[PDB]
Swiss-Prot record, chain A:
It is found in: Nucleus; Nucleus speckle; Cytoplasm. Homodimer. Interacts with DAPK3. Component of the precatalytic, catalytic and postcatalytic spliceosome complexes. Part of a spliceosomal 'core' complex consisting of CDC5L, PLRG1, SPF27, CCAP1, CCAP3 and CCAP6. Interacts with PLRG1, Lodestar/TTF2, and NIPP1/PPP1R8. Component of the minor spliceosome, which splices U12-type introns. Within this complex, interacts with SCNM1. Component of the PRP19-CDC5L splicing complex composed of a core complex comprising a homotetramer of PRPF19, CDC5L, PLRG1 and BCAS2, and at least three less stably associated proteins CTNNBL1, CWC15 and HSPA8. The chain holds residues 6 to 235 of 802 of the full protein. The modification Phosphothreonine is found at residue 124. This is Cell division cycle 5-like protein.
Curated annotation (Swiss-Prot), chain C:
Component of the 17S U2 SnRNP complex, a ribonucleoprotein complex that contains small nuclear RNA (snRNA) U2 and a number of specific proteins. Part of the SF3B subcomplex of the 17S U2 SnRNP complex. SF3B associates with the splicing subcomplex SF3A and a 12S RNA unit to form the U2 small nuclear ribonucleoproteins complex (U2 snRNP). SF3B4 has been found in complex spliceosome 'B' and 'C' as well. Component of the minor (U12-type spliceosome) spliceosome. Found in a complex with PRMT9, SF3B2 and SF3B4. Component of the 17S U2 SnRNP complex of the spliceosome, a large ribonucleoprotein complex that removes introns from transcribed pre-mRNAs. The 17S U2 SnRNP complex (1) directly participates in early spliceosome assembly and (2) mediates recognition of the intron branch site during pre-mRNA splicing by promoting the selection of the pre-mRNA branch-site adenosine, the nucleophile for the first step of splicing. It is linked to Acrofacial dysostosis 1, Nager type: A form of acrofacial dysostosis, a group of disorders which are characterized by malformation of the craniofacial skeleton and the limbs. The major facial features of AFD1 include downslanted palpebral fissures, midface retrusion, and micrognathia, the latter of which often requires the placement of a tracheostomy in early childhood. Limb defects typically involve the anterior (radial) elements of the upper limbs and manifest as small or absent thumbs, triphalangeal thumbs, radial hyoplasia or aplasia, and radioulnar synostosis. It comes from the Eukaryota. This is Splicing factor 3B subunit 4. It is found in: Nucleus. It comes from Homo sapiens. Residues 2-78 form the RRM domain. The modification Phosphotyrosine is found at residue 45. Belongs to the SF3B4 family.
Length: 132, 55, 78
RNA sequence: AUCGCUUCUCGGCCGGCUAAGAUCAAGUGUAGUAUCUGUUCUUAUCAGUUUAAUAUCUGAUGUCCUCUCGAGGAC
């Protein structure tokens, strides 16, 4: 019931919330949005919205590396995805794309505690000061 | 050079994008006011503004 | 002549007392009195587009009698 | 007096530890409106529908003949 499609409003508000609160507090960020939970917010951050994620075409090297690795460790996408530097869902889609296109008074009264200054080789007798 | 001779000859002896926007708004459509120099106006709002003008 | 340049003003003046001020003579159709963004205040010089040119030449004749904040107001053709 | 370094002085811009301490609220449907975002018409002319006028929609690119869209001739 809570599940559904992601909205530009929810997604931008997710950007701002993640910016303000920080990465480790999910319940606080899920509190602001409606119809979405904390798990969904976190996985939605790390899966897609995260700026460190690389959204662009795959170069030739990334295709060589992806194909080789996928033939090395079949069906393991969460192991391969960090090695090529792409999202697991993304490299999946691209792979099926490659096979697809490959064929109180202490203050104010009396001076709290008083230290009269000590007296030294000079005359302080005379000195007094003006009012305000 | 010929240009120069000519000028000397005929000179005083003593010198002193929104394409559908303009259709929607009704502009860049050919129109004419007769009383003013048989003038051309490209918009109906503009010609309606001609009614109050200096010229 | 449809437009005039107006110098020597005080920022408490705005586009409104110019509106009101020069339409006392004849209506200002297009008003321009810059708002400076950086320090949010006016240098006090103006540009005025009228209905046609006759308005503005009479405006050259009459126009420089205005005195904004006890002080002199420049109006010339443009 | 000047240059450089330094000292002092002044002015202008100018929230402790723990198991992260623990935990974490959503009604529905019938009608209907508003407000955001994205995308499309340089088409030339005429005829009709249509409009307050636009807009929009709907149709074709002076005629004939000859030769290989072009050329010539007769209007």
């Amino acid at each position: 019931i809570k599940g559904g499609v992601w909205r530009n409003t929810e997604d931008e508000i997710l950007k701002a919330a993640v910016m303000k609160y920080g990465k480790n507090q999910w319940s606080r960020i899920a509190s602001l949005l409606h119809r979405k939970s904390a798990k969904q917010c976190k996985a939605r951050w790390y899966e897609w919205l995260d700026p460190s994620i690389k959204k662009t075409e795959w170069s030739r090297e990334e295709e060589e590396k992806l194909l080789h690795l996928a033939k090395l460790m079949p069906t393991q996408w969460r192991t391969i995805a960090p090695i090529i530097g792409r999202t697991a869902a993304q490299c999946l889609e691209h792979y099926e794309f490659l096979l697809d296109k490959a064929a109180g008074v202490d203050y104010n009264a009396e001076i709290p505690f008083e230290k009269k200054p000590a007296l030294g080789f000079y005359d302080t007798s005379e000195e007094n000061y003006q009012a305000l | 050079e010929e240009e120069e001779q000519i000028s000397e000859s005929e000179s005083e002896d003593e010198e002193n994008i929104p394409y559908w926007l303009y259709k929607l708004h009704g502009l860049n459509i050919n129109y004419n006011c007769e009383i003013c120099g048989n003038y051309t106006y490209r918009g109906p709002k503009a010609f309606q503004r001609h009614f109050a003008e200096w010229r | 002549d449809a437009t005039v340049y107006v110098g020597g003003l005080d920022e408490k003046v705005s586009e409104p007392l110019l509106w009101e001020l020069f339409l006392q003579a004849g209506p200002v159709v297009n008003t321009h009195m810059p708002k400076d963004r950086v320090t949010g205040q006016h240098q006090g010089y103006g540009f005025v587009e009228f209905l046609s040119e006759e308005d503005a030449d009479y405006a050259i004749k009459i126009m420089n009698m205005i005195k904004l904040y006890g002080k002199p107001i420049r109006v010339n053709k443009a």
